[PDB]
Subunit: 408 residues, 2 copies
Amino acid sequence: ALTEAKHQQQFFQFRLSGQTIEVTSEYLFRHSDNELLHWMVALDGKPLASGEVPLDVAPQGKQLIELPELPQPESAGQLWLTVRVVQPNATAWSEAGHISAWQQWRLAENLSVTLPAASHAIPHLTTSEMDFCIELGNKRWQFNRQSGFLSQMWIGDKKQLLTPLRDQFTRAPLDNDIGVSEATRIDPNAWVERWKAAGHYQAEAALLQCTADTLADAVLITTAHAWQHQGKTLFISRKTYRIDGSGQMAITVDVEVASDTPHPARIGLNCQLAQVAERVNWLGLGPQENYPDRLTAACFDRWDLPLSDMYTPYVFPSENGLRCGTRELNYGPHQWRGDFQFNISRYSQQQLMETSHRHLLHAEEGTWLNIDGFHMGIGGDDSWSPSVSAEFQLSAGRYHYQLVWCQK
Amino acid sequence: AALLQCTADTLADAVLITTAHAWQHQGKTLFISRKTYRIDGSGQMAITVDVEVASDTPHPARIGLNCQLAQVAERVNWLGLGPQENYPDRLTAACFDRWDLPLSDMYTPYVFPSENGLRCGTRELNYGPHQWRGDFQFNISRYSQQQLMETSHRHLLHAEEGTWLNIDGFHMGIGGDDSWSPSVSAEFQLSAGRYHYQLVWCQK
């Protein structure tokens, strides 16, 4: 949280107009005299340009900054401008090179109008009454026809999942979701209570449909489940998996949420990976944990960190570590692509949810991955009543998202 | 537009068409539309659409489809907001229900012709033998957008061959705080980038 503060409370303010940056000083008494502005342009994580400019703004003043002609490539992707204010010299409370402020903008987008290279190969579908198998190369994917989930996958002789890939609509309650609700004295208004009461945490799936079809150049799986509790259908998930000659699966998901059920904490999938890698690399917001109503301090870019850093050791364990606006995530040989929020650690939601202290958590078999098409905000106006603003509640009813899972 | 792809595939119990276009202007791709039509034994087509809007292009007024129908019917019946013209930043007075009115009533004779007659939150619309189902906003009259756009007065409009139908997955707000500067609030601007929608067209 500390960063979100730091950024919001920063003393310099920016506005971008064309290729001119307007800087506003919120200092009342001092002049920007230990301040440098670093600027920089990059295309999907790739740096194309940098500058540095000394700030000469008086308290309550403005400074105009015109940027050099900015490169612009043919390549697809998003072009982002990022600026940082630096304190070149040390003060009594800061080191040299301390960053006092920052801001970023999206400059342009070159949309990708390029269709992939027609698959050399073609996947084979092997049916059975238990499942559908897809093979292509060393790669194989299995979908269980009884459950409707992708139960396993192999690269070579190695299995990748410990747990099937499945829909997730809940979260290990944050302090704010709980509020002052106790086992003794239940607060029926607390998000958790609502969710609890409505069956979110204990709803059971229901295969409505599960089919395989052979396309000209790919296999197409199609499923549908209903989550229900006491004969009430809470949600409905409709997917399509489409594996192609490239050995890429494209998941497309479409949820329907009942108008009359408390809005879900989230909407995405999760699964337990078999692997355990040392780093995580992604192209999205970061580097730090960021939620929807708490992500202004985060920057879009390519981040690479140790797994350990993707977990936030809140003494009272709960959902944590999320990173939003992710476009690509890489872990081991996996790579997922799209627009989603995600989190990844060695602790299942359930373990988090069931441990009173962080010191009692134990790392699980592999890596737990939660990939969200959507996530509700965290709130915080107070911690004893619902504080999540409406804009951050998953109240649309219809939700759509897509992924591309693949390997390297 | 630009055909990027167009394929037919045969499914166990249906046909599946798949397309992709790019709209561009001066080598800039503004939008990208990706659909799938899926016709089944029921003789129902399900359209599924997915638009990508360039971050750096003014947000579009809308996002949907249109076409000119050959038929011309006397009534329009729908299940959604109405009965009156309603836009996104202007629909609190409207009620969700089943409305049935004369075609004539689906056009708003603003003396200075412009986009009009929209009805939001529609779940089902019926015109002649057609029935469309989903979640969309729509409008329907005898005037193309172009005709509206090119006529200074309403008295000069002429009804066109059949019925023009505009079905929107999304529509930007109308504004009004004032009429001499942009007045559409941000919440009503189509600024997401990624837009998804689906329809079911069929007959009775």
